[PDB]
Ligand binder design. Structure first.
Ligand code: OBJ
Ligand code: CL
Ligand code: CL
Ligand code: CL
Ligand code: CL
Ligand code: CL
Ligand code: CL
Ligand code: CL
Lengths: 238, 231
């Protein structure tokens, strides 16, 4: 059986994920090197990879059912306080952690060693989380709800926290329906609990990214673009 | 009498070297990294806020500071507090014995400090040994501490009254080095840039604790953290 609206919801969530992801069949290995340059170039690349995904991740956000119906202030805070979380999660799902290949949403493929000078040791945690994520063998339907749950959660400063809460419960309900239906009606309480357990791991992982942005901002070798600053200020807690 | 006024302002806002407080001190490493993280983070905040009342009284006892517009007095204080907190701690402490001595006389071992201060305390101790190897007398330190707060800022109301106060302090410092000591003044005044870099390590630590949200900073620490972020 299925919740009412569960099939149409999870279908729209899968379409949102597929439409906002890079063509694996036609990716870009132009700068890929398995085994350097100045610091300013690597930091600028770090900023540029973050910025380029912002517009794509918000396009994915606008294709979640009911997300557009929220107030714009709620849409902005939800998207902003979840951007790095979505950036990390979608990068960890997309990448090849065994080969150290980081695959970004514009299709650019870079090796883990090519990213350490921009990302810092934060790239080592992203690779580790990617292996753990991929070891769970999460299909696209279950991933698409987990991705939407990373954004549709409670945040301080929401104007109408119910529609968020009401949308979040519907996403949880259709993730449960899928896990049960896919397994032939047999519930999987372990896979689900481990699946939802990846959201706090992702939140912890994206504080490491905020510390990296704060570090680069204070040392002031390459100032962040204005939109990285706005991302930083609008999401500082309390 | 200006440098004597700065020396007395330092002496009055600092614990008498014989009235040290070992009530919290612990030499045994088994007990130096004990207890929950909450009381360790809270003690970290409490030492920071406990130094605000002390450094503020030290600033008011600097000749001419109180004669500035208080909007400038607050901008000067609230933008050098962490630098002053670290500089006075590094000058007060016993880095070779691993003893950090705070402005209330409380003595804590370095290993008692890592749970709250984090990695930051190692860099503080390193800076503390480098500072004391210069054997800066109390007269030159009182000038240097004042110069950490009486300096260039964006948004002051009479910035050249601060500058004229600043250069009065610089001139008497140079007069002191002349009478008493290529000189250590170049590396001494260079310790203020190195202090600033050490201060931004402290902001990283407070930023981390804010993100962890185990014990959120008090409003006063949160305000001054937010007020020194470069946008
Ligand atoms: S880095 C320049 C030194 N002084 C300051 O930053 C202002 O004093 C502060 C700064 C940050 C925090 Cl959290 C406090 Cl409590 C005081
Ligand atoms: Cl796309
Ligand atoms: Cl995919
Ligand atoms: Cl691959
Ligand atoms: Cl949830
Ligand atoms: Cl389904
Ligand atoms: Cl559940
Ligand atoms: Cl100077």
């Amino acid at each position: 059986h299925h919740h009412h609206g569960a099939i149409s919801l999870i279908s729209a969530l899968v379409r949102a994920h597929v439409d906002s992801n890079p063509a694996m069949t036609s990716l870009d290995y132009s700068r890929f090197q398995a085994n350097s340059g100045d610091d300013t170039q690597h930091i600028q690349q770090f900023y540029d990879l973050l910025t380029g995904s912002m517009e794509i991740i918000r396009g994915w956000a606008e294709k979640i059912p009911g997300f557009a119906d929220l107030p714009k202030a709620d849409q902005d805070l939800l998207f902003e306080s979840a951007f790095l979380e979505l950036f990390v999660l979608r990068l960890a799902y997309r990448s090849n952690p065994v080969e150290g290949k980081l695959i970004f949403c514009n299709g650019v493929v870079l090796h883990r060693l090519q990213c350490v000078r921009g990302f810092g040791e934060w790239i080592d945690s992203i690779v580790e989380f990617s292996s753990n994520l991929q070891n769970m063998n999460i299909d696209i339907s279950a991933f698409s709800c987990i991705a939407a749950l990373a954004m549709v959660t409670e945040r301080h400063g929401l104007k109408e926290p119910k529609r968020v809460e009401e949308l979040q419960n519907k996403i949880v309900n259709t993730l449960k329906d899928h896990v049960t239906f896919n397994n032939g009606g047999l519930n999987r309480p372990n896979y689900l609990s481990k699946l939802l357990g990846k959201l706090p791991e992702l939140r912890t992982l994206c504080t490491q990214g905020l510390q990296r942005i704060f570090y680069l901002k204070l040392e002031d070798l390459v100032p962040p673009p204005a939109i990285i600053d706005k991302l930083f200020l609008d999401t500082l807690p309390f």
